């Protein structure tokens, strides 16, 4: 069929779309009385800006510990378990949304985070020495 190209769905626009379709639009969610006017209206917005900047820097630091530095779609060296609700890759990447995939591994996220952060990157950079 005919077409032009991509579209701008929104900030959280790809929620509900399939797993492979939302994997191409990670850019749009990673990019996002004069004295009285400068004491209550001028400090709360500044606090919100500082909070957003500091939250982004600490989460990007948590990405940087895993060895991904500043990439969006990163790759690592950890074997995927036969447990943790393993299916074939076609049903994972063509049928389920990201919300159901996060609800399915809601119990098992901390084990994966400990496998990424500890005993892999320290092990790999031990092997580099």
């Amino acid at each position: 069929a005919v077409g032009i190209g991509a579209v701008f769905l929104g900030f959280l626009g790809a929620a509900g779309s399939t797993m492979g379709a939302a994997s191409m639009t990670l850019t749009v969610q990673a990019r996002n009385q004069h004295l009285l006017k400068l004491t209550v209206w001028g400090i709360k917005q500044l606090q919100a800006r500082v909070l957003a900047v500091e939250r982004y820097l600490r989460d990007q630091q948590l990405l940087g510990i895993w060895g991904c530095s500043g990439k969006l779609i990163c790759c690592t060296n950890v074997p995927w378990n036969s447990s943790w609700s393993n299916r074939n890759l076609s049903e994972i990447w063509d049928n389920m949304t990201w919300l159901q995939w996060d609800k399915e591994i809601s119990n098992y996220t901390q084990i994966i985070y400990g496998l990424l952060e500890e005993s892999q990157n320290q092990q790999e950079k031990n092997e580099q020495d």
Epitope: A1, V2, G3, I4, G5, A6, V7, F8, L9, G10, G13
Partner: nanobody, 120 residues
Framework: QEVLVQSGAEVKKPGASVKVSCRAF????????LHWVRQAPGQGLEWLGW????????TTSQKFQGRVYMTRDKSINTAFLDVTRLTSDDTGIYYC???????????????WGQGTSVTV
């Protein structure tokens, strides 16, 4: 709840230019492409062209170049159709249509406006 609101009935003399509008409600405007479809009285429906509301790219068929123009406005979520060089064959109704737009390709037309009547 997803609807398209068009302009009223326009009356016109031949040779000049006319502008109609289509405003989207119930969905995000920069997500789906918009088709423009004409119907003559007593005949079938006829297709003009279609515009991506995000990139600003327009596509028109091989027999309305320089006669049919297509613009957008993302601030007020509107699509403007400019029809120039009006003849006696152009009396009819205008439809703005939302493409379903599955996998970045044309699939079908699901949402249609109430229509705009033009008489020349």
């Amino acid at each position: 709840q997803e609807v398209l609101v068009q302009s009223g009935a326009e009356v016109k003399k031949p040779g000049a230019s006319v502008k109609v509008s289509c405003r989207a409600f119930g969905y995000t405007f920069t997500g789906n492409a918009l088709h423009w479809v004409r119907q003559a009285p007593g005949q079938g429906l006829e297709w003009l062209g279609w515009i991506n509301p995000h990139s600003g790219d327009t596509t028109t068929s091989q027999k309305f170049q320089g006669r049919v123009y297509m613009t957008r406005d993302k601030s007020i979520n509107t699509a403007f159709l400019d029809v120039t060089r009006l003849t006696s064959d152009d009396t009819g109704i205008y439809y703005c249509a939302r493409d379903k737009y599955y996998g970045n390709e044309a699939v079908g037309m699901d949402v249609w406006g109430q229509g705009t009547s033009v008489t020349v």
